Design a protein around this ligand. Structure first.
Ligand SMILES: *[C@@H]1O[C@H](CO)[C@@H](O)[C@H](O)[C@H]1NC(C)=O
Ligand SMILES: *[C@@H]1O[C@H](CO)[C@@H](O)[C@H](O)[C@H]1NC(C)=O
Ligand SMILES: *[C@@H]1O[C@H](CO)[C@@H](O)[C@H](O)[C@H]1NC(C)=O
Lengths: 449, 449, 449
């Protein structure tokens, strides 16, 4: 809708509100097939140049099949990482079924007459099939009358050119699979062309507005998809495409921006610092909040946030209280402490946080007008209305030029409520109460003395 | 062999045993050559369409050579990172030799009659050579009678098509090298086709079962290899392929899984936490243990672990005592402390650790039966026998479906042996004794008072 | 010039001096155009094989245009990350202008007669234009007399082959843009060939020695560039290439190497450790020092360092005092403390730091001579003169073979100036004075008692 933003001067943080959710919760598994020819590399006596080229491209086909055969032996399972298990388990389950006797025949037969079908496998999963390239019919009808005789028939050059074209796709598929150990992501247009992907989106048992969502964001849908190599058996090459399912849609999302907040004394080493933790994306999800701590797991498209729940934490909705009253007791807001007063900026959705310390030169400029604000020591913020760049020391940053309203929530920097002599100044993952507890402990060790 | 797994309730950790080692310790360097033609871009008067296409593809060849010439000037050396020095130094050493006078002639001459050879260079390294594409013979015999006259001879269309085909590989090689600054990894099938790689594996002075190991895991062999650009000199393009050498084979490996272990009091902020560090892969290696702390440096293929020793630490074998008696004195087991009681799961090899805290909903489900276990606050574990998924808050995880035996080692959670008032609750990289030492120090500051 | 290196025994660190700077501060934006044909996929009755191939390649063209049309709707803006805002804002600004009425016509018209031009847009930016592929003229003059009639004219096979060739580039461009959501980096040779890039470098309003710098490091220039998709409107495909501008040139750069420094007592757990922080690249920049903490943001070419200022911190030049007198007061040198005495090495520019502890076996070897140094417990260093490898436990490292002079600055390891009983042994981001302050605090808690 209408993007908005709040900067909290008291904690050197900012929240961008107004975004709408799209969280991956499930997976559609589709089977993609290429019908192959069982040729025997039949050789006949021929030195005709058009015969050589047909043999040369038939060898590239033979090798492609044989490399895919040595690659399906080695169980494709290297799309797992970071303790979350395998993203691909849904599809690896389908590959296991395909290796069952008569299951390839079952797709062979549904794809006897048509390109699309809905096959139910003997494990109860109703997969969408698709034949995307027919090399069995091509090689068997155009190329065997050419090599299956005592002396070779001579082909026309259009056949030579059309075979190179048709075989190309099989080769690029093999190429990708052999440098990725059977699993790819993103899913390339060789794995699945824009037309085939859009048909597959159109053909799924899902709601029309969610078909619209995927069609309008196909690049993001690709980036969140996998292609898994299954099996080459009985004149069929089969691989599984795993497409994202968005079980959470149109819940509010917001992004937390954080920057270090220090004191501004003139003596170096007399200064204390604190910074809010768990910067990142927060989406309302099923009564709680899904939190996405890694910067890259969320792709943003206008006002929609596409995230994978696989690398997220689930928090109580009280976590939002850290943005309105960082001292409330409902939620133990987490902070980091240091004495590292080094200047820096964070480009937010509608502006920029600037943490300026020491002798660093900190400004915000307009392209035509030059400098229009100078930041003082401390943590400060500027809206993107009328600003194009911000500079901190020798680095220049470009402010985002999105339309929206910022709100500067004034407040005392909470670093000023702390006595520097009893401040726990090297805390890596503490909390507001956990710092007040060590202060109250260290106020007792000075109480007796 | 038979994968097994032990979960230690007392420390919220688990070990997967049964894997077999394959650690990269060395490098084979092979020289890959493409013989080139020194054509002068000879132009003759011709507007015949088949002449244009031959000129168009000869310009793409000329430029390819000239870009590779400007790229070999800039010393290919950007495959170094993280303080470990250069992975590629073995091959960069061979490139330096190749620039010596008469060393290209020496390979020119061994490859006068055959495609394979074993050349000894003037530095005593016995490299495997290989001519993979002959453009000198092709261009000099099919294309100069076509452009080296007053008026051009006209070529047949098969020549046009065959030249595009043969020249393609040179172009994709140039493409790769110019976006990677002379070093690539993985090694693409353009750098080295599956056939050429399998021949090169077959042709090395190594033991037959280790030839088998590499042939059966070519995708992993590629991912651990480099291609380095050397030199274009005297009608030869030469680049070096560095293949992995597995100096450690068939020693036991095991993977440590760790998850946070906290108290389960009902009051928020009254809870302490600890977590074991150095999760990852451990392989027995030459009387010690090679430890691989980064998740991605180890590719797993069935029960074999392929790791690069370049990013590993070497530990005493006593490090395994942390999995059997975390309090023993032989080895100072390392732990992290916090008050971050946030729920999470770790998908292990044969099961799942679940650290459930607060109000988080934590279950394990079977596809057909639905929920079949509910986790309580604390750290717990479930085997993959009869379970397909585990859910923690809004995230769903897929359990691995490998065959093996799990063993639930019951025990008191060691977090319960600690007095929360004297607990060092924000320790980033501590150790069991190092925490007991600060407890014993803080038991003295309360002893006088 | 002459690379040099200093190892500081007192702090287990080393500095490599002698490098020359090249820091990205700005951006050149160029507009790259491909003139397109507005064909209507005109179908006529034809089953001639050469007609099929022309239709097949015209469909691949139609789809390419239509996918690029659905991709330009979704605002290309996923080259932003890590709080630094968008690297691409300079170019996204040009895309916004191009969507203005009559701005595509303005480039259409400057490129009516020539391939190069300098167009001033209605926002005052003087961009370099370029027409790199003309498919409007090709399709309109060779292919419409072929499909714009009642029955199709038959084309020659050279036309079929030339169209495949010319259309290829458009297809690979679409391929790249659709798996990258409209932004690519590095800039591929499909986005911009070496010839086109070198012309664009030659054609910019910049100084001749800086043209030389870019021409001689084109691979690095690519790696630091972006390609952004703009707009398909009025028979023009336009995308923006953003090339690096080096606002800082030929200032001194140096790289800091750091390794843990511990005590060498024989009892495990009685040992304290400290390590200098902020290892990395330091370049003099405009009276301060630009510091590059991430290892990969700086590409090194002989003695030149190419860095992006976007991910850098700006420090006072007094930060160099940490390498000459780590205790000076001008700058609060930052250190990390632990009890993690685990052995390791750092390969420097002209040598190797070795931190050897426990029972670890630590040597430096020469290829022909074998072991030539054995390291003792502590932190030590060896020059690359006469050494080829260094081994720490089970890992082998290759020393860099660059020419230069090392200097071993002897000195007492400063870890020895600390009383282990009052040492803050788990400090994550402390400083020299900040450790002396907690020592002086903990010397008072023992003073009363
Ligand atoms: C600190 O401790 C005193 C006495 O033990 C108590 O009365 C006071 O409320 C405590 N304050 C905080 C903020 O915990
Ligand atoms: C703690 O200190 C006391 C006296 O200094 C000593 O007797 C005791 O063994 C120590 N305990 C530990 C666990 O270090
Ligand atoms: C430590 O404190 C004493 C008295 O408070 C002071 O005289 C001394 O100079 C201090 N030393 C340091 C290194 O701060």
């Amino acid at each position: 809708q209408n993007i908005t933003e709040e900067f909290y001067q008291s904690t050197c943080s900012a929240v961008s509100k107004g975004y709408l959710s799209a969280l991956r919760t499930g997976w559609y598994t589709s089977v993609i097939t290429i019908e192959l020819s069982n040729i025997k590399e039949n050789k006949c006596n021929g030195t005709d140049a058009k015969v050589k080229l047909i043999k040369q491209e038939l060898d590239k086909y033979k090798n492609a099949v044989t490399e895919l055969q040595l690659l399906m032996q080695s169980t494709p399972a290297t799309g797992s990482g970071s303790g979350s298990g395998s993203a691909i388990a849904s599809g690896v389950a389908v590959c296991k079924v395909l290796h069952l006797e008569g299951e390839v025949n079952k797709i062979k037969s549904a794809l006897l007459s048509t390109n699309k079908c809905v096959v139910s496998l003997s494990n109860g999963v109703s997969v969408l099939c698709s034949k995307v390239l027919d090399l069995k019919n091509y090689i068997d009808k155009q190329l065997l009358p050419i090599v299956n005789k005592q002396s070779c028939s001579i082909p026309n050059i259009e056949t030579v050119i059309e075979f190179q074209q048709k075989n190309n796709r099989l080769l690029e598929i093999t190429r990708e699979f052999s440098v990725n150990a059977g699993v790819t992501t993103p899913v390339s247009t060789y794995m699945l062309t824009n037309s085939e992907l859009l048909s597959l989106i159109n053909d799924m048992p899902i709601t029309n507005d969610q078909k619209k969502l995927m069609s309008n964001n196909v690049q993001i849908v690709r980036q969140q998809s996998y292609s898994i190599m299954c099996i080459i058996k009985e004149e069929v090459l089969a691989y599984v495409v795993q497409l994202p399912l968005y079980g959470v849609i149109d819940t509010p999302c917001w992004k937390l921006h954080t920057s270090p907040l220090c004191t501004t004394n003139t003596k170096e080493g007399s200064n204390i610092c604190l910074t809010r933790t768990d910067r990142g994306w927060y989406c309302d999800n099923a009564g709680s909040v899904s939190f996405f701590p890694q910067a890259e797991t969320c792709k943003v498209q206008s006002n929609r946030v596409f995230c994978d729940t696989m690398n997220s934490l689930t928090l109580p909705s009280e976590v939002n209280l850290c943005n309105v009253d960082i001292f409330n007791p409902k939620y133990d807001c987490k902070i980091m402490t240091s004495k590292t007063d080094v200047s820096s900026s964070v480009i937010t959705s509608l502006g920029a946080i600037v943490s300026c310390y020491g002798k660093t030169k900190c400004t915000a400029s307009n392209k035509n007008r030059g400098i229009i604000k100078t930041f003082s020591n401390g943590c400060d913020y500027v809206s993107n209305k009328g600003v194009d760049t911000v500079s901190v020391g020798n680095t220049l940053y470009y402010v985002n030029k999105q339309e929206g309203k910022s709100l500067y929530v004034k407040g005392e920097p909470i670093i000023n409520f702390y006595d520097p002599l009893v401040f726990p100044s090297d805390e890596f993952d503490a909390s507001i109460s956990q710092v007040n507890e060590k202060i109250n402990q260290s106020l007792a060790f000075i109480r007796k003395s």
